[PDB]
Design a protein around this nucleic acid. Structure first.
Lengths: 215, 100, 50, 136
RNA sequence: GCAAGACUAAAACUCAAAUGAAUUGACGGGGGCCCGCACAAGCGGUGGAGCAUGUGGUUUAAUUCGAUGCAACGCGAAGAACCUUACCUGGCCUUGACAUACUAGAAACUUUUCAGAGAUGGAUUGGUGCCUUCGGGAACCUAGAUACAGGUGCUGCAUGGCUGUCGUCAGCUCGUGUCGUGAGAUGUUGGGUUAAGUCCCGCAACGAGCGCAACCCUUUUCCUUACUUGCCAGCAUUUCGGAUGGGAACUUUAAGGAUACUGCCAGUGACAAACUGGAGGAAGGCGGGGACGACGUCAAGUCAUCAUGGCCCUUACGGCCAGGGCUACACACGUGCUACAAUGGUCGGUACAAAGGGUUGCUACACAGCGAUGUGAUGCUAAUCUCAAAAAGCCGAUCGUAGUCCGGAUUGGAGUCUGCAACUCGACUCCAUGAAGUCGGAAUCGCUAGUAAUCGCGGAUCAGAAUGCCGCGGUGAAUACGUUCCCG
């Protein structure tokens, strides 16, 4: 049947929210809409910079956007021009002064979003999907995850009838609420339509609960 | 929704915002007990002579992302589809699955 | 949850608002300036009344 | 069920007479959770029978219950004791419902007294069960 | 050969197969074992009446579109008078209401009117702004040009994403070693047991993953911290109201902890897994409820949330407006509400909740009105003020089995409020009227305990508009011998 969102089911159990601010009921809607616009704009702009996570905070009448990226040099720019331009556009969009911060990912193969992006890029570049899936799974397992599952759905190879193919090595305990499972979904736009890609990565069980996680 | 419908909503919002002040002035003048019956009567006639789009009752809440006119949820400003997607992604602060 | 027609297929969400009250009595001079020197953490809103 | 044996639900004794039989009769009389009305109905009849013959309300009720108690259902087989009492109370409330009087309590007392002499629709239905048991 | 027929016995023509044995599935109106409100035992319903609501049909200018056995029919729609709106009639526009790219000119904006149903069109005022290496630039508007925009148009049988269903069913797999020429088998079977491939034994098998369970939320007992806006045991003052000094005991509020584990005893089963009984304990064998839905099936549903391949329209299948329609009505079906009364109706007096909402809002109190409501005024950004009256309940009076002092449909006449506007087509109040209905055939539905039944209260959507939906508490039952048949 249908499965619950792995991050949604753990948002209060072992996972942290992607937005951390308080607002009164009158201002909640405006804050949320501006946050969504910021996320969409950043996703469009940083397509080729290997960006997985964006965290938005509103400490006191200002904004702080933390970008988790595997290409810190590209994101920062040659001399810091890109970050100050980004601050200008974000302040313009958000109506308050904004501070951009960079968090560098040191193990890109353990990030669910980057793997899905790479697989989708290969599918758009029309490599065979089974080779792409096996290569990505082997690369992640060598990188050191305890389990990874990759699924592709659609008109695979250009066939007139769509189908779904998946591949898994290791352990993926989806029903364990305390398991650390990264999840990602992506689209490949080919001449024959859309192909959907889903990636699950398991990185061990978190102990101590949300008290340990320090919400 | 369609671009025409979204632009219609935008135009109605602009008209309401433009005519907000005079409508309140006329309504207060109508409610004024000290004012003459004639003052209230021409106030009512002017209110009826105001443009139709100036009335707030013709505004319909639409999703801020797609423009859907059903299932609005005033608190978030999004319809149910986008609310489900964004909440399950984790971009709404404080919202979790509810059990009791 | 379904895009077209399943009335019994719904997700139930909740949001909670927590409140705390703190009283300071016999305030020293350093107390106040310390309170504005104190940092503001995201996700917590503070109101001070004198 | 299919696999398990579910225990019978023990009912508390009546707080006024300490009589599980009276409590069960009250539960049979009661409709949609209105316990106070049923308590009033039963207690009024118990006081009425006491005045119209000076007998103990509990003993007079047990004797009438044993009089209106059947012995067999329907294939003949021996009805277990709990079902005997459960069936007797149903007959005694159903037949009492159909008399003509001002209150349910007075009707209940009247037909309790009537059944104490063996005159009543409940005893007639008991004789009907006797006849159709002789049939089998 | 009496006959029926027997025996001997071809070819033309046509196809690329026809066959045997065994393997894995699937199915059987084949057989065993097992489970489930499946039946049985009970308590209430539907099918009968009036009304609400959705669908089919019919009608219409239009009655917009989708959902169709269980798994469509109070479904998308968490709320159609205009708007929404996608449909009809009529009136209008054409690089367009919206984007990018090019060329020129203007601040943008603002006042007053006129014609018109409006969209629109024509006159009419003020202002003419911000940076500047200041030769122009920043928004913003107007004029021209073409690449184009735009499409709730078609294809869910080209797709992504999302969802229903079997079904909270208990299964689904992989690596070494053995048997088989082989596909394959074994393990995963057999004996007990369990809510469960849950656990224990034997056994050419020896080992692992996803499923079950646990980790998450809530409720039941106790401890620590915290003492206001919440609390009041002891003291004091009281207008007898925690009202006031005051107290930190209790209730509560809400964070962190402790506890339950067959732990102890007895009997059984194998002597194991377990199972039955007893003490203590708030709670005893899974204490109660929620979320979480394996490998897969249905070319299941959605191109009308959105995105997307392909096809189609371009003075129209695009865009703007006023009025109408989605609310029709000889009929049929589904889901509900209210009743047919005395375990009740009406009148007077008097008790006991939980959860949730409130600044474009909720309103104490006073006055006016029979009333819905109106006016003045007070507190509240809320454990502080308010919605707010809980209702069934208890005591007293009356009605006496009648189509009634039951029932409350329909219609006539007056009104209030929201809104630019209640004719089509709103909700509520008052006076008058007082329909069917006497417990409902064949058949069929829900429920195993704080459950069914019954009583009230709140919210989302929302100017106004719930008998629907999602929640909250009050009172509080009956029956389970068992698997012989019905369904899965």
């Amino acid at each position: 049947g249908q499965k619950v969102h792995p991050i949604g089911i753990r948002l209060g159990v072992v996972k942290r929210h992607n937005a951390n601010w308080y607002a009164n009921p009158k201002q909640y809607a405006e804050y949320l809409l501006k946050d969504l616009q910021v996320r969409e704009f950043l996703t469009k702009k940083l397509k080729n910079a290997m960006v997985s996570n964006i965290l938005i905070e509103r400490p006191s009448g200002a904004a702080k956007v933390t970008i988790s990226t595997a290409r810190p040099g590209i994101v920062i720019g040659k001399k810091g021009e890109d970050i100050e331009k980004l601050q200008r556009e974000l302040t313009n969009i958000m109506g308050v002064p904004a501070q951009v911060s960079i968090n560098e990912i040191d193990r890109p193969d353990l990030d669910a979003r980057l793997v899905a992006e790479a697989i989708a890029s290969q599918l758009e570049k029309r490599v065979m999907f089974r080779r792409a899936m096996k290569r990505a799974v082997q690369n992640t397992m060598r990188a050191g995850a305890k389990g990874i599952k990759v699924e592709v759905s659609g008109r695979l190879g250009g066939a007139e009838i769509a189908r779904t193919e998946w591949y898994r090595e290791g352990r993926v305990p989806l029903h364990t609420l305390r398991a650390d499972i990264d999840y990602a979904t992506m689209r490949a736009e080919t001449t024959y339509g859309t192909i959907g890609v889903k990636v699950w990565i398991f990185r061990g069980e978190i102990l101590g609960g949300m008290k340990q996680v320090m919400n | 929704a369609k671009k025409g419908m979204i632009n219609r909503e935008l135009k109605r919002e602009k008209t309401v915002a433009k005519y907000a002040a005079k409508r309140a002035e006329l309504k207060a003048t109508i409610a004024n007990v000290n004012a003459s019956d004639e003052e209230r009567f021409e106030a009512m006639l002017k209110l009826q002579a105001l443009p139709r789009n100036a009335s707030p009752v013709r505004l319909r809440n639409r999703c801020g992302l797609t423009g859907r006119p059903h299932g609005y949820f005033r608190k978030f400003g999004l319809s149910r589809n986008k609310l489900r997607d964004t909440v399950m992604q984790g971009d709404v602060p404080g919202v979790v699955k509810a059990s009791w | 949850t379904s895009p077209h027609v399943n009335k019994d297929a719904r997700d139930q969400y909740e949001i909670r608002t927590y409140k705390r009250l703190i009283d300071i009595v016999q305030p020293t001079d350093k107390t106040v300036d310390a309170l504005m020197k104190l940092d503001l953490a995201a996700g917590v809103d503070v109101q001070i009344a004198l | 069920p299919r696999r398990r044996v579910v225990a019978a639900r023990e009912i508390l004794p009546d707080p006024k007479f300490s009589s599980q039989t009276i409590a069960k009769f009250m539960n049979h009389v009661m409709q949609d959770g209105k316990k106070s009305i049923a308590e009033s109905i039963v207690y009024g009849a118990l006081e009425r029978v006491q005045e119209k013959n000076k007998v103990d309300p509990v003993e007079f009720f047990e004797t009438t219950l044993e009089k209106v108690r059947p012995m067999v259902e329907v294939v003949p087989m021996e009805v277990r004791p709990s079902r005997r009492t459960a069936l007797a109370m149903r007959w005694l409330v159903d037949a009492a419902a159909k008399r003509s009087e001002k209150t349910m309590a007075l009707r209940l007392a009247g037909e309790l007294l009537d059944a104490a002499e063996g005159k009543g629709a409940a005893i007639k239905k008991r004789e009907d069960v006797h006849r159709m048991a002789e049939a089998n």
